[PDB]
């Protein structure tokens, strides 16, 4: 025959013999077992073969549903999107009018006293930026702005954007007034600052400073001010504000960074101290940049950089056989080593997973060895984020444990670290901890946790898992409105998953013996399928070419009903 | 349809445009009568090249990327008596062909040199032995010490 | 019939230590069936050809045999990283009887007695869906524009399809179906040959720039370049 | 630049260095033995050596030349702009009043008279981008209706960026007689307050070209293209690729190429061949995309350098790569011939010589591509067909010239001097053919600028050390052609004449000054100039001090030959070619 078989078959596992690899086999050509040869690869199902298969479905689910069309995708249209002759300079001149000098200083000293690790990852001396705040208002009167001064302008307005994202509504209300804005904006004066108005003004300040960069001609004159500004702005939900623009500026940043072609950052014995400090500065800029490279990794991110940094396992397994700045990169690079399996159906085997775990206790103690000052919100900021990330990685690791091999009580581990993460959110409802509920690491981590706990409780209805579902259902409403519609779509998702929780239990799992026919499964298929379809840019390419016009059972009907009710594409704008 | 070989000896050799196809240099130069310098080839040897083209321009050729039609291609008897010429001027013919990239002619001159290099006497090879340095003379002495029981 | 001589066994058990290896080459057709015509059989007590050194190699030469698929399938299930499979003096080959691993570019051959093809002539006629005599009569331009006459290949009729009759769809699709045999190999190089059964079908991109070539076309004519 | 490096190496290491337990620069006698006056110790070892009559520094001299010519005439002369972020201001608004003057300087009949010239001649270029000029005529009609709309699509904004880039290309190749037959210069005369005997051919044509390009970029401002990846962006950038837009602002071109590579790879499609399960329309989209992409790899290579950190090309023309020879020969012909020179030029930064076999193959395929351009017909009235012939003809000259030069330098085979000479005159006679009517603007292509730059570099440098009067006749014809270069270049054309001058004056400085021998380490002020010229220009290219100034205002810290070196650097400082 031709176009033969691949590996030993069900008849071969029946007989444990040599596999002559034919059609049906040379095994199966002997004793006429073609029915046994072909019934390995309709009625109602009666097994638990759906669950390992569905856990392996959960991986490719989570690489798309939790990841891309919900989060890392913005649908757009070239006709629908306007041009930019208007609010070109104009909205920027508004927001450059509306900000004031003391209004700058109070934001600065908020972010100085409360957000130390950020500009530690960006600039260090924030009072050297105070100098630029001082030179700004002189330069506010100026006209013939140099490229350097405009870079400082971009930097300070990016920091001013950052300050809005973490200030509580009360202090911002003490500085500003809703009504001069909502008269200029023409919107409802009735809403607070917290209810998107912090968010909308934050996005405005983002857009203005990027337009300052457009006035810079940074694409004509790249410098590391761009990368520092981008690493400032990446702490917000600006990757969810404009993901495509963020990938563009990320590309410009990696272009600008590698334009100097520097590999190691710890110097020789004989440099300029300015040069040595510069290379070490690029050290922390580099790890914060590759962190964003990991966090913005998607099919609309075609250019990768954290592949260039080697794995932490291949270095640490030898010696096992500032500190928190590199530790952030340790945890995120360890996640990088973890989660290439998101789109890879091959199993992580039970050693490097255990290597990650048995290093991860040392990482846990390194988090334990860190301090938090109750006086320094810079210090609670410094400790709490690492304390979040360690259990984030720990949860994802034990989720891999229960999915790929059913490691014993990894469900209990999931529940345990879920308790820890919930109590970390609980601690954020205090004074000098509110804006800890604002950084998007919770917006991803909690989304993955609630999605997997939803996924478990649709099928294996554990009342502890259901109690965790109720706790996260409360925790849904316990979130700031700084996240916007990605919040709300999660609310939709926490809807729709739970609504899938309706449909699975009420209808018996049909099959043909192994092809487990259920309309729930086909819904979850088309969830991924439509998202990946709108993730293709080829339709936009055919649109870009112009004259090439863009062209185009119960198991069926229940899908037809629930999807016409629950559009999976309710998750865009 | 006629182009002119101009050697380093100035001797204008007006040949046909069809003849120029043997020099890949000159055939591709045909896009730019027509003359061209040749900095090295003396005009009698260039005339020998022209006469080779006069024979073989009617003739078949290998594909120049071959194995059999490069290595086991036997020579032409025309080329044999055509190139039973001076020793040093044979090198000049070969240099001419390598200049103008006349590759089958290059091979035809080359294989005669091959037939010269094999098929030479073992006695003269024993004689013409270190006509380049190639050794230390201690090694020369040791090799002579090895085989002297025969000679 | 799986049996070997002791010198070859001593060679294979010592084979691993190279780490600088290329160009494994075998001649004995019996031995060929045992050692690289993998034939599905992933196990023998000795005679294990050492997956690491399976991986290391670059190219494979097969000198003189009768049929490479004396069995139903001349496989290369392993030998992931080959580039240049070369056939010297086997008598008959089916092109289809080979599994052709992941990504290799050159496949040259010579001196054979019989050549099947990958029978692509049939597979073309599923798409444009005409008669073979129309395909040989209506669908032949036999292009010799200027670059075809670089070489002679004057034993052979050097054909090309018509640019007029096909509306440039079921042409690119036709050409991709030609490609689907090849799995992105490029260099083909037909020396001295004998008895092609089918026609000669070559994709345009691969015959332009002369990555395929013919040296001694004797028993053979009628090449179409599509 | 120094070593002994003479003819006729021996084979075995010499006896004197094995005595002295050192290395063997295996010369006659050695540069390790005649270094110490130990001459006949190593001379009269075996056989007999002759008089070392060479300019025996010459091999290492030409090696250092290749590294130099890498740094100067691709990187330093073109791919680097001397910039200060404090003196030169930023652009606050500065542009709408700037661009819209040029926008209104073009009218509709004025636009279509350019488009006709494009249809005449530029069909070798814009065909790979889009092909049909009639659809492009339709887009021009769409914009002259959309000239004063309000709800502009981002789509139509890309079409406008496309067509104004097309107009920029039309500026870049029109003979200025017909330009004055379409336009009147005096809006510029009173728009800048510049001089008055100032028709466009005195450089104002290029200023007009640059400002038209900047106008197309001004449309890209309102595109918000960094939020909108379009393939038409890449199309218009390939329209720019025909121009001296890289030579306008190469730093700008770098980021623009960067976003286009991001844009292309955002499609995540690799083969361009269709499949059985495809839309035919989407298949034709892929086939067009192939033409776009292999053209895109072109100036990707041609802008590659230390200011281009992000590689694209992952395929090999000769002999882990991705995508090659699954592609029809229609314009990858133009890619293949460039990728050949990619295989060449990787031995410029690289210390190691290329292995000879690779060059051997490259010669064979070079002569192969001689015939595929010979497979072009003779379209008589299609001038664009003849220009299309001219492009591949010039490139197959070009890579050949670069090829034999490497034989002469790294290996020094038969006539490889004379081959380079012959190819040089082939290039010259191509420009002679271009000096005919209906052929002059063919010389406005960037590749002839780069190729002539390399040729007049290497021939002048060789002419300094070797006064072969055939090469001097070549050099006189080079300078004669250099003055006869068209006026489309200007600034780089003047930097060319500066470097020509600097070589012709260093020609004097070698020939009057004695070569300070020290056994093997030969010394001369010409050496010490050129040894440090690369250091100057790499220190320029070391933009670490820009990073220092970008990490705040932290102010950083970091012989008889010196006489002649500083005198020549006074009379000719190398930094006269940056601006
Ligand atoms: Zn079996
Ligand atoms: Zn020595
Ligand atoms: Zn010596």
UniProtKB/Swiss-Prot annotation, chain A:
Keywords: Centromere, Chromosome, DNA-binding, Metal-binding, Nucleus, Phosphoprotein, Zinc
An individual GO BP term: kinetochore assembly
Stored CDD domains: Cep3_C (cd12147), GAL4 (cd00067)
A Pfam family hit: Zn_clus
DNA-binding region listed in the record: 9-37
Protein localization: Nucleus; Chromosome, Centromere
GO molecular function (one): identical protein binding
Annotated InterPro entries: Cep3_C (IPR031760), Sec_Metabolite_Reg (IPR050613), Zn2-C6_fun-type_DNA-bd_sf (IPR036864), Zn2Cys6_DnaBD (IPR001138)
Additional notes on this entry: Present with 1900 molecules/cell in log phase SD medium.
Subunit annotation: Component of the CBF3 copmplex, which is formed of CBF3A/CBF2, CBF3B/CEP3, CBF3C/CTF13 and CBF3D.
Protein's job: Acts as a component of the centromere DNA-binding protein complex CBF3, which is essential for chromosome segregation and movement of centromeres along microtubules. CBF3 is required for the recruitment of other kinetochore complexes to CEN DNA. It plays a role in the attachment of chromosomes to the spindle and binds selectively to a highly conserved DNA sequence called CDEIII, found in centromers and in several promoters.
Protein name: Centromere DNA-binding protein complex CBF3 subunit B
The species this protein was found in: Saccharomyces cerevisiae (strain ATCC 204508 / S288c) (Baker's yeast)
Gene: CEP3
Swiss-Prot record, chain B:
GO cellular component, one term: RAVE complex
UniProt entry keywords in alphabetical sequence: Centromere, Chromosome, Cytoplasm, DNA-binding, Kinetochore, Nucleus, Phosphoprotein, Ubl conjugation pathway
Renumbered residue ranges of the record's region Interaction with the F-box domain of F-box proteins: 94-151
GO BP annotations listed: cellular response to methylmercury; exit from mitosis; G1/S transition of mitotic cell cycle; G2/M transition of mitotic cell cycle; kinetochore assembly; mitochondrial fusion; mitotic cell cycle; mitotic intra-S DNA damage checkpoint signaling
Sites of Phosphothreonine modification: 136
Disulfides per UniProt: none
Alphabetical list of InterPro entries matching this protein: SKP1, SKP1-like, SKP1-like_dim_sf, SKP1/BTB/POZ_sf, Skp1_comp_dimer, Skp1_comp_POZ
SMART domains: Skp1 (SM00512)
Superkingdom of this protein's organism: Eukaryota
GO molecular function: cullin family protein binding; DNA replication origin binding
Pathway annotation from the record: Protein modification; protein ubiquitination
Subcellular location as annotated: Cytoplasm; Nucleus; Chromosome, Centromere, Kinetochore
Keyword Methyltransferase appears in the UniProt entry: no
Primary location class: cytoplasm
Primary role: Essential component of the E3 ubiquitin ligase complex SCF (SKP1-CUL1-F-box protein) ubiquitin ligase complex, which mediates the ubiquitination and subsequent proteasomal degradation of target proteins like phosphorylated SIC1. Participates in the attachment of chromosomes to the spindle. Acts as a regulatory component of the centromere DNA-binding protein complex CBF3, which is essential for chromosome segregation and movement of centromeres along microtubules. CBF3 is required for the recruitment of other kinetochore complexes to CEN DNA.
Protein family per UniProt: Belongs to the SKP1 family.
Curated annotation (Swiss-Prot), chain C:
Gene Ontology molecular functions: DNA binding, bending
Record keyword Nucleus present: yes
GO BP term (any one): septin ring assembly
Entry GO CC: CBF3 complex; kinetochore
Main location, first listed in the record: nucleus
Compartments (UniProt record): Nucleus; Chromosome, Centromere
Keywords, sorted A to Z: Centromere, Chromosome, DNA-binding, Nucleus
Subunit field text: Component of the CBF3 copmplex, which is formed of CBF3A/CBF2, CBF3B/CEP3, CBF3C/CTF13 and CBF3D. CBF3C interacts with CBF3D and SGT1.
Biological role: Acts as a central component of the centromere DNA-binding protein complex CBF3, which is essential for chromosome segregation and movement of centromeres along microtubules. CBF3 is required for the recruitment of other kinetochore complexes to CEN DNA. It plays a role in the attachment of chromosomes to the spindle and binds selectively to a highly conserved DNA sequence called CDEIII, found in centromers and in several promoters. The association of CBF3C with CBF3D and SGT1 is required for CBF3C activation and CBF3 assembly.
Protein name: Centromere DNA-binding protein complex CBF3 subunit C
The organism of origin for this protein: Saccharomyces cerevisiae (strain ATCC 204508 / S288c)
Name of the gene: CTF13
From Swiss-Prot, chain D:
GO cellular component: CBF3 complex; kinetochore
Note: Present with 1900 molecules/cell in log phase SD medium.
UniProt cross-references to InterPro entries, sorted A to Z: Cep3_C (IPR031760), Sec_Metabolite_Reg (IPR050613), Zn2-C6_fun-type_DNA-bd_sf (IPR036864), Zn2Cys6_DnaBD (IPR001138)
One GO biological process term: kinetochore assembly
Keywords for the protein's UniProt record, in alphabetical order: Centromere, Chromosome, DNA-binding, Metal-binding, Nucleus, Phosphoprotein, Zinc
Signal peptide: none
Keyword Metal-binding part of the UniProt annotation: yes
DNA-binding region location: 14-42
Protein name stated in the entry: Centromere DNA-binding protein complex CBF3 subunit B
Domain of life of the organism encoding this protein: Eukaryota
PANTHER family recorded: CENTROMERE DNA-BINDING PROTEIN COMPLEX CBF3 SUBUNIT B, UNCHARACTERIZED TRANSCRIPTIONAL REGULATORY PROTEIN
Assembly and oligomerization: Component of the CBF3 copmplex, which is formed of CBF3A/CBF2, CBF3B/CEP3, CBF3C/CTF13 and CBF3D.
Compartment(s): Nucleus; Chromosome, Centromere
SUPFAM superfamilies per the UniProt record, alphabetical: Zn2/Cys6 DNA-binding domain
GO MF terms, alphabetically ordered: centromeric DNA binding; DNA binding, bending; DNA-binding transcription factor activity, RNA polymerase II-specific; identical protein binding; zinc ion binding
UniProt entry tagged with the keyword Phosphoprotein: yes
Functional description taken from the UniProt entry: Acts as a component of the centromere DNA-binding protein complex CBF3, which is essential for chromosome segregation and movement of centromeres along microtubules. CBF3 is required for the recruitment of other kinetochore complexes to CEN DNA. It plays a role in the attachment of chromosomes to the spindle and binds selectively to a highly conserved DNA sequence called CDEIII, found in centromers and in several promoters.
Gene: CEP3
